[PDB]
mmCIF file of all heavy atoms in Angstrom:
data_model
loop_
_atom_site.group_PDB
_atom_site.id
_atom_site.type_symbol
_atom_site.label_atom_id
_atom_site.label_comp_id
_atom_site.label_asym_id
_atom_site.label_seq_id
_atom_site.Cartn_x
_atom_site.Cartn_y
_atom_site.Cartn_z
ATOM 1 N N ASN A 1 89.821 106.315 112.974
ATOM 2 C CA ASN A 1 89.500 107.688 113.336
ATOM 3 C C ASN A 1 88.910 107.719 114.730
ATOM 4 O O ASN A 1 88.822 108.783 115.333
ATOM 5 C CB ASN A 1 88.555 108.315 112.333
ATOM 6 C CG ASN A 1 87.224 107.658 112.234
ATOM 7 O OD1 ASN A 1 87.117 106.463 111.940
ATOM 8 N ND2 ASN A 1 86.185 108.443 112.403
ATOM 9 N N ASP A 2 88.544 106.534 115.251
ATOM 10 C CA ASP A 2 88.000 106.336 116.590
ATOM 11 C C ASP A 2 89.090 106.506 117.661
ATOM 12 O O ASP A 2 88.756 106.620 118.838
ATOM 13 C CB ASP A 2 87.304 104.953 116.710
ATOM 14 C CG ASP A 2 88.159 103.688 116.598
ATOM 15 O OD1 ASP A 2 89.420 103.800 116.608
ATOM 16 O OD2 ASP A 2 87.571 102.587 116.509
ATOM 17 N N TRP A 3 90.376 106.522 117.256
ATOM 18 C CA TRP A 3 91.466 106.672 118.205
ATOM 19 C C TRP A 3 92.563 107.668 117.759
ATOM 20 O O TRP A 3 93.252 108.220 118.637
ATOM 21 C CB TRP A 3 92.082 105.312 118.550
ATOM 22 C CG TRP A 3 92.906 104.629 117.493
ATOM 23 C CD1 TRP A 3 92.456 103.782 116.523
ATOM 24 C CD2 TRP A 3 94.338 104.560 117.451
ATOM 25 N NE1 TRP A 3 93.521 103.247 115.830
ATOM 26 C CE2 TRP A 3 94.687 103.702 116.383
ATOM 27 C CE3 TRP A 3 95.359 105.180 118.175
ATOM 28 C CZ2 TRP A 3 96.009 103.465 116.015
ATOM 29 C CZ3 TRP A 3 96.672 104.945 117.805
ATOM 30 C CH2 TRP A 3 96.985 104.099 116.736
ATOM 31 N N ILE A 4 92.720 107.909 116.426
ATOM 32 C CA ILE A 4 93.744 108.831 115.927
ATOM 33 C C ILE A 4 93.147 110.252 115.742
ATOM 34 O O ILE A 4 92.285 110.482 114.885
ATOM 35 C CB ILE A 4 94.449 108.297 114.639
ATOM 36 C CG1 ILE A 4 95.074 106.902 114.882
ATOM 37 C CG2 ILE A 4 95.522 109.308 114.126
ATOM 38 C CD1 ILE A 4 95.476 106.142 113.675
ATOM 39 N N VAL A 5 93.633 111.194 116.556
ATOM 40 C CA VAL A 5 93.240 112.613 116.555
ATOM 41 C C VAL A 5 93.838 113.308 115.315
ATOM 42 O O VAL A 5 93.153 114.056 114.607
ATOM 43 C CB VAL A 5 93.705 113.289 117.881
ATOM 44 C CG1 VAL A 5 93.384 114.761 117.904
ATOM 45 C CG2 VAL A 5 93.084 112.617 119.093
ATOM 46 N N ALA A 6 95.120 113.069 115.080
ATOM 47 C CA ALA A 6 95.860 113.633 113.978
ATOM 48 C C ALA A 6 96.928 112.654 113.538
ATOM 49 O O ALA A 6 97.511 111.987 114.393
ATOM 50 C CB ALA A 6 96.494 114.930 114.422
ATOM 51 N N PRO A 7 97.215 112.497 112.230
ATOM 52 C CA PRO A 7 96.594 113.151 111.069
ATOM 53 C C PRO A 7 95.299 112.431 110.620
ATOM 54 O O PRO A 7 94.978 111.350 111.148
ATOM 55 C CB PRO A 7 97.710 113.072 110.025
ATOM 56 C CG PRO A 7 98.436 111.783 110.336
ATOM 57 C CD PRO A 7 98.257 111.533 111.817
ATOM 58 N N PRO A 8 94.526 113.002 109.660
ATOM 59 C CA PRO A 8 93.277 112.344 109.229
ATOM 60 C C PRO A 8 93.521 111.076 108.397
ATOM 61 O O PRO A 8 92.648 110.203 108.287
ATOM 62 C CB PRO A 8 92.597 113.427 108.408
ATOM 63 C CG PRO A 8 93.707 114.232 107.881
ATOM 64 C CD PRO A 8 94.719 114.283 108.957
ATOM 65 N N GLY A 9 94.717 111.000 107.840
ATOM 66 C CA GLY A 9 95.209 109.885 107.054
ATOM 67 C C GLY A 9 96.680 110.107 106.784
ATOM 68 O O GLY A 9 97.274 111.013 107.372
ATOM 69 N N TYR A 10 97.286 109.319 105.896
ATOM 70 C CA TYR A 10 98.700 109.492 105.561
ATOM 71 C C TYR A 10 99.051 108.638 104.352
ATOM 72 O O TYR A 10 98.328 107.678 104.034
ATOM 73 C CB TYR A 10 99.620 109.156 106.770
ATOM 74 C CG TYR A 10 99.994 107.692 106.938
ATOM 75 C CD1 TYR A 10 101.302 107.259 106.729
ATOM 76 C CD2 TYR A 10 99.042 106.747 107.326
ATOM 77 C CE1 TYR A 10 101.645 105.921 106.868
ATOM 78 C CE2 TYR A 10 99.371 105.401 107.449
ATOM 79 C CZ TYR A 10 100.675 104.994 107.228
ATOM 80 O OH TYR A 10 100.987 103.673 107.348
ATOM 81 N N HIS A 11 100.162 108.978 103.680
ATOM 82 C CA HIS A 11 100.612 108.236 102.508
ATOM 83 C C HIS A 11 101.508 107.122 102.958
ATOM 84 O O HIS A 11 102.641 107.373 103.359
ATOM 85 C CB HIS A 11 101.319 109.166 101.510
ATOM 86 C CG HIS A 11 100.448 110.288 101.051
ATOM 87 N ND1 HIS A 11 100.213 111.391 101.863
ATOM 88 C CD2 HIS A 11 99.743 110.421 99.904
ATOM 89 C CE1 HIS A 11 99.393 112.167 101.178
ATOM 90 N NE2 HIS A 11 99.086 111.625 99.990
ATOM 91 N N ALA A 12 100.972 105.898 102.958
ATOM 92 C CA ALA A 12 101.681 104.696 103.399
ATOM 93 C C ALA A 12 102.482 104.072 102.288
ATOM 94 O O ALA A 12 103.604 103.644 102.531
ATOM 95 C CB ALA A 12 100.698 103.670 103.953
ATOM 96 N N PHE A 13 101.901 104.009 101.071
ATOM 97 C CA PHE A 13 102.426 103.347 99.868
ATOM 98 C C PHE A 13 102.284 101.862 100.032
ATOM 99 O O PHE A 13 101.823 101.417 101.080
ATOM 100 C CB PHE A 13 103.889 103.702 99.596
ATOM 101 C CG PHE A 13 104.084 105.153 99.305
ATOM 102 C CD1 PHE A 13 104.435 106.035 100.311
ATOM 103 C CD2 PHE A 13 103.918 105.647 98.019
ATOM 104 C CE1 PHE A 13 104.627 107.387 100.031
ATOM 105 C CE2 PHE A 13 104.115 106.994 97.743
ATOM 106 C CZ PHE A 13 104.467 107.852 98.748
ATOM 107 N N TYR A 14 102.662 101.087 99.014
ATOM 108 C CA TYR A 14 102.667 99.642 99.105
ATOM 109 C C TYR A 14 103.573 99.064 98.019
ATOM 110 O O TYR A 14 103.883 99.752 97.045
ATOM 111 C CB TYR A 14 101.242 99.053 99.085
ATOM 112 C CG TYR A 14 100.567 98.977 97.737
ATOM 113 C CD1 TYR A 14 100.557 97.789 97.007
ATOM 114 C CD2 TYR A 14 99.859 100.060 97.230
ATOM 115 C CE1 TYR A 14 99.931 97.707 95.768
ATOM 116 C CE2 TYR A 14 99.202 99.980 96.003
ATOM 117 C CZ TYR A 14 99.248 98.803 95.272
ATOM 118 O OH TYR A 14 98.623 98.715 94.054
ATOM 119 N N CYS A 15 104.037 97.825 98.208
ATOM 120 C CA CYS A 15 104.872 97.187 97.208
ATOM 121 C C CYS A 15 104.088 96.156 96.450
ATOM 122 O O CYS A 15 103.325 95.379 97.041
ATOM 123 C CB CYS A 15 106.098 96.571 97.852
ATOM 124 S SG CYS A 15 107.137 97.762 98.691
ATOM 125 N N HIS A 16 104.303 96.132 95.136
ATOM 126 C CA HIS A 16 103.681 95.162 94.247
ATOM 127 C C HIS A 16 104.505 94.937 92.987
ATOM 128 O O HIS A 16 105.263 95.815 92.555
ATOM 129 C CB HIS A 16 102.249 95.556 93.868
ATOM 130 C CG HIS A 16 101.435 94.364 93.473
ATOM 131 N ND1 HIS A 16 100.856 93.531 94.430
ATOM 132 C CD2 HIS A 16 101.198 93.852 92.246
ATOM 133 C CE1 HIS A 16 100.261 92.566 93.752
ATOM 134 N NE2 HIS A 16 100.438 92.715 92.435
ATOM 135 N N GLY A 17 104.344 93.756 92.418
ATOM 136 C CA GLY A 17 105.043 93.365 91.213
ATOM 137 C C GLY A 17 105.794 92.064 91.343
ATOM 138 O O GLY A 17 106.033 91.563 92.439
ATOM 139 N N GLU A 18 106.146 91.518 90.197
ATOM 140 C CA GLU A 18 106.833 90.252 90.025
ATOM 141 C C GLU A 18 108.318 90.392 90.372
ATOM 142 O O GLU A 18 108.895 91.479 90.262
ATOM 143 C CB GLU A 18 106.644 89.810 88.561
ATOM 144 C CG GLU A 18 106.912 88.342 88.258
ATOM 145 C CD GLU A 18 107.853 88.051 87.097
ATOM 146 O OE1 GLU A 18 108.091 88.950 86.253
ATOM 147 O OE2 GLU A 18 108.354 86.906 87.033
ATOM 148 N N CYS A 19 108.915 89.273 90.802
ATOM 149 C CA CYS A 19 110.328 89.145 91.145
ATOM 150 C C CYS A 19 110.971 88.138 90.168
ATOM 151 O O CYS A 19 111.038 86.950 90.490
ATOM 152 C CB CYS A 19 110.478 88.717 92.603
ATOM 153 S SG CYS A 19 110.111 90.030 93.793
ATOM 154 N N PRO A 20 111.396 88.575 88.955
ATOM 155 C CA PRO A 20 111.890 87.609 87.941
ATOM 156 C C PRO A 20 113.413 87.463 87.818
ATOM 157 O O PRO A 20 114.136 88.162 88.523
ATOM 158 C CB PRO A 20 111.355 88.208 86.641
ATOM 159 C CG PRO A 20 111.318 89.714 86.902
ATOM 160 C CD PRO A 20 111.329 89.943 88.398
ATOM 161 N N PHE A 21 113.904 86.599 86.883
ATOM 162 C CA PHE A 21 115.346 86.463 86.666
ATOM 163 C C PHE A 21 115.850 87.564 85.714
ATOM 164 O O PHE A 21 115.297 87.689 84.616
ATOM 165 C CB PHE A 21 115.739 85.066 86.134
ATOM 166 C CG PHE A 21 117.072 85.068 85.408
ATOM 167 C CD1 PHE A 21 118.269 85.181 86.111
ATOM 168 C CD2 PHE A 21 117.128 85.016 84.018
ATOM 169 C CE1 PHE A 21 119.491 85.257 85.438
ATOM 170 C CE2 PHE A 21 118.354 85.069 83.347
ATOM 171 C CZ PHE A 21 119.526 85.181 84.061
ATOM 172 N N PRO A 22 116.931 88.313 86.054
ATOM 173 C CA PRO A 22 117.696 88.305 87.313
ATOM 174 C C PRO A 22 117.122 89.291 88.347
ATOM 175 O O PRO A 22 116.295 90.149 87.995
ATOM 176 C CB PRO A 22 119.103 88.695 86.846
ATOM 177 C CG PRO A 22 118.873 89.598 85.635
ATOM 178 C CD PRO A 22 117.458 89.342 85.134
ATOM 179 N N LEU A 23 117.550 89.164 89.626
ATOM 180 C CA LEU A 23 117.057 90.034 90.709
ATOM 181 C C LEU A 23 118.096 91.066 91.202
ATOM 182 O O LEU A 23 117.691 92.105 91.736
ATOM 183 C CB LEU A 23 116.564 89.205 91.910
ATOM 184 C CG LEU A 23 115.242 88.456 91.754
ATOM 185 C CD1 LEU A 23 114.962 87.649 92.970
ATOM 186 C CD2 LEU A 23 114.090 89.403 91.547
ATOM 187 N N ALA A 24 119.418 90.787 91.010
ATOM 188 C CA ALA A 24 120.576 91.601 91.437
ATOM 189 C C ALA A 24 120.487 93.110 91.065
ATOM 190 O O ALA A 24 121.110 93.921 91.761
ATOM 191 C CB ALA A 24 121.865 91.011 90.885
ATOM 192 N N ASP A 25 119.690 93.482 90.009
ATOM 193 C CA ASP A 25 119.417 94.868 89.548
ATOM 194 C C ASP A 25 118.706 95.698 90.669
ATOM 195 O O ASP A 25 118.601 96.934 90.592
ATOM 196 C CB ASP A 25 118.582 94.853 88.254
ATOM 197 C CG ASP A 25 117.364 93.953 88.324
ATOM 198 O OD1 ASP A 25 117.540 92.716 88.322
ATOM 199 O OD2 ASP A 25 116.240 94.486 88.395
ATOM 200 N N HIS A 26 118.215 94.969 91.695
ATOM 201 C CA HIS A 26 117.649 95.433 92.949
ATOM 202 C C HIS A 26 118.751 95.350 93.999
ATOM 203 O O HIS A 26 119.207 94.236 94.303
ATOM 204 C CB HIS A 26 116.463 94.546 93.366
ATOM 205 C CG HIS A 26 115.123 95.079 92.999
ATOM 206 N ND1 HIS A 26 114.632 96.245 93.559
ATOM 207 C CD2 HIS A 26 114.176 94.545 92.194
ATOM 208 C CE1 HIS A 26 113.419 96.404 93.051
ATOM 209 N NE2 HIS A 26 113.098 95.403 92.227
ATOM 210 N N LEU A 27 119.216 96.517 94.530
ATOM 211 C CA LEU A 27 120.210 96.593 95.624
ATOM 212 C C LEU A 27 119.708 95.723 96.817
ATOM 213 O O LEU A 27 120.478 95.010 97.473
ATOM 214 C CB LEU A 27 120.409 98.067 96.072
ATOM 215 C CG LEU A 27 121.725 98.779 95.701
ATOM 216 C CD1 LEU A 27 121.638 100.276 96.006
ATOM 217 C CD2 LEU A 27 122.937 98.180 96.441
ATOM 218 N N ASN A 28 118.377 95.776 97.028
ATOM 219 C CA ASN A 28 117.613 95.043 98.006
ATOM 220 C C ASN A 28 116.963 93.855 97.293
ATOM 221 O O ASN A 28 116.017 93.997 96.502
ATOM 222 C CB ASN A 28 116.591 95.957 98.709
ATOM 223 C CG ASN A 28 116.099 97.121 97.873
ATOM 224 O OD1 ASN A 28 115.702 96.957 96.714
ATOM 225 N ND2 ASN A 28 116.130 98.331 98.436
ATOM 226 N N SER A 29 117.571 92.678 97.541
ATOM 227 C CA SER A 29 117.230 91.314 97.115
ATOM 228 C C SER A 29 118.222 90.396 97.816
ATOM 229 O O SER A 29 119.408 90.407 97.478
ATOM 230 C CB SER A 29 117.281 91.165 95.598
ATOM 231 O OG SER A 29 116.236 90.327 95.146
ATOM 232 N N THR A 30 117.765 89.706 98.877
ATOM 233 C CA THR A 30 118.596 88.821 99.708
ATOM 234 C C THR A 30 119.034 87.595 98.981
ATOM 235 O O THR A 30 118.339 87.141 98.076
ATOM 236 C CB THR A 30 117.847 88.392 100.942
ATOM 237 O OG1 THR A 30 116.594 87.796 100.574
ATOM 238 C CG2 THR A 30 117.650 89.520 101.893
ATOM 239 N N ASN A 31 120.142 87.002 99.415
ATOM 240 C CA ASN A 31 120.642 85.791 98.760
ATOM 241 C C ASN A 31 119.550 84.726 98.627
ATOM 242 O O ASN A 31 119.413 84.126 97.557
ATOM 243 C CB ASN A 31 121.847 85.230 99.488
ATOM 244 C CG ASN A 31 123.103 85.983 99.155
ATOM 245 O OD1 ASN A 31 123.340 86.365 97.996
ATOM 246 N ND2 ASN A 31 123.941 86.205 100.160
#
């Protein structure tokens, strides 16, 4: 807040959780 005038905050989100067998059910999962 010492440098950002606007906005006061924002919705960033985050990723969490296990990566188990199988992974292909995720469009995004590299070889």
Side-chain angles (χ1 to χ4, degrees):
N1 63 302
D2 66 10
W3 72 272
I4 303 166
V5 177
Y10 86 111
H11 302 77
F13 296 95
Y14 78 98
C15 299
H16 204 81
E18 198 231 342
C19 286
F21 158 73
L23 287 177
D25 49 289
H26 263 295
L27 252 170
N28 29 49
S29 218
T30 55
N31 281 320

